[PDB]
Design a binder for these strands. Structure first.
Length: 153
RNA sequence: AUGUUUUCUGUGAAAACGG
């Protein structure tokens, strides 16, 4: 037994609870684009450079952006196993985008998918129509979301 | 409290500032 704003709040709560975050549809879109920009050529960056790199290009339009918040967003992708991490003896690990995820379509999918797996981990039944609200600020992506939900289940 | 930030090699940890 759960209402719309009961589910949203709980979703964002479980998300924050894993050191992840969603900055609203527009800002999250731009972030992910910058991650690609950074890593589509196969560049390998440490987590810190990566965050900065994004934070810097993003600050102009979204003055809220911080090493912290973007850090979270990166952690979301980290958890969704998009990065091909590479250890270094007592140094920052290096991070690359797995080949499969070097397109936006591909990345944004795996990103969305992860948010859902959290919802699932959290026992939260949300319908495509609402997902498309939550993640894109509109109803233009039910089909997309439905596909994500089905391809997990 | 709700948040916000900071550090870090994090399917994550540890803190600080609001009040």
């Amino acid at each position: 037994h759960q209402n719309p704003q009961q589910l949203s709040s709980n979703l964002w709560a479980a998300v924050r609870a894993r050191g992840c975050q969603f900055l609203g549809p527009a800002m999250q879109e731009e972030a992910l684009k910058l991650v690609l920009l950074a890593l589509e050529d196969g560049s390998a960056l440490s987590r810190k450079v990566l965050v900065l790199f994004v934070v810097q290009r993003l600050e102009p339009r979204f003055p809220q952006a911080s090493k912290t918040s973007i850090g979270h967003v990166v952690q979301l992708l980290y958890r969704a196993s998009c990065f091909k991490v590479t250890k270094r003896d007592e140094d920052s690990s290096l991070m690359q985008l797995k080949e499969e995820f070097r397109t936006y379509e591909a990345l944004r999918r795996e990103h969305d998918s992860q948010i859902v797996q959290i919802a699932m981990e959290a026992g939260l039944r949300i319908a495509p129509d609402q997902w498309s609200s939550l993640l894109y600020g509109d109803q233009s992506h039910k089909s997309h979301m439905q596909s994500i939900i089905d391809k997990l289940q």
